[PDB]
Endonuclease G, mitochondrial
Amino acid sequence: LAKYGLPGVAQLRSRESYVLSYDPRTRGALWVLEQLRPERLRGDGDRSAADFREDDSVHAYHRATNADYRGSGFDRGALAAAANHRWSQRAMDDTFYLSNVAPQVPHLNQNAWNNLERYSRSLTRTYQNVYVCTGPLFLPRTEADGKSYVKYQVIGKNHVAVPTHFFKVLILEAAGGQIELRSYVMPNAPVDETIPLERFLVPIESIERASGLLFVPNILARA
Amino acid sequence: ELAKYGLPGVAQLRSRESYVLSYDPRTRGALWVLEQLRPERLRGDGDRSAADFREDDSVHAYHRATNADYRGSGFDRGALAAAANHRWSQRAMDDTFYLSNVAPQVPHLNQNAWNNLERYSRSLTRTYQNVYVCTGPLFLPRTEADGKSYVKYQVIGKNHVAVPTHFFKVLILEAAGGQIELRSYVMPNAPVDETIPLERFLVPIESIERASGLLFVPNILARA
Ligand SMILES: [Mg+2]
Ligand SMILES: [Mg+2]
């Protein structure tokens, strides 16, 4: 049966600063996983951000390019954020692979998603370890005919999918081995950043039901 | 260190008696379904008892299409690996009625023009040494009035089972010199005129590989 190979299997990529799984249909990451180091800012300022680079490990049929973003009116939103990974130049450089990138409404990337990333880093003062899983959603909506539809834009030659929403799952270890899960969803839209961040909390089941994903699966019974 | 709680998202291969498939939990749908066709031997395969569609308890319930998702939708439960391919054993036919092998199909298409494509596929086992078939959904973008391109598909049921916009069917045909051919078909998920000849839905395989995220040619070239 499988004598002519399998047409598609899971595309994990490990980089210096994150691991991701890649969806070649949407030309985007399914999820991106990272740890946030405490702050320390003093060995590891000082960092010289890179150009964005398409990912040669992805087949060119299925690979976002800088031309796909240029003139789209979306920014290149890095899912594993570059400011999480100033602890190493290679660590920071790897966040500028476009496989780490989704089309993001610039106001979201600039203001309220930025605030979410800075709050996530701040929890390293408070917890034994902080891990973060970031990814896209494509959430359906009801229309006038009573039916539900997924509708998302695609941009560029390569039809790079524009997510309707983004999730960020904070995986927070407090000191007992105890894992706390904090789950945020924002729309791919202008979002007022003075709205407190707890208003974008959603139950983790919601993200898991909609995204296809099952987070922290080694945790057989959650707290 | 990142793996210490394990990874969010796993490859979902299922091997059944009559096909291998890969499963997308986000669309609640197979990415592709891969089968090897038998010669048409109705006498030799003999009688089969009835099967109806049942949900795939091997898929997590968050992501598992059920019969209730289809009831009322106006779509047929369209099997990707077709039941009539696999009368050679009862297990083989029964496994095609897992809803993980099923996509929402416009009932006219399931009954006339996709059925004709399936029957034509089985007829090629009269000629070729082997016929491999890989079937799957597509979700193709369209341009709208604003000049921009969107993907739009319906989801049905409590479980949001995605309705493909199109279907693809790739045939791999062996003849006797070590000859290997690929042939690719796309139809819309729509009432298709069942008197249009099937050759008109031939598309080059690159167009399917580009749109689907899948790769067929490099595997097959590698094995020669
Ligand atoms: Mg960014
Ligand atoms: Mg069918």
Residues 11-211 of chain A form a domain with the Extracellular Endonuclease; Chain A fold (CATH 3.40.570.10). Residues 184 and 201 of chain A are 5 Å apart (CA to CA).
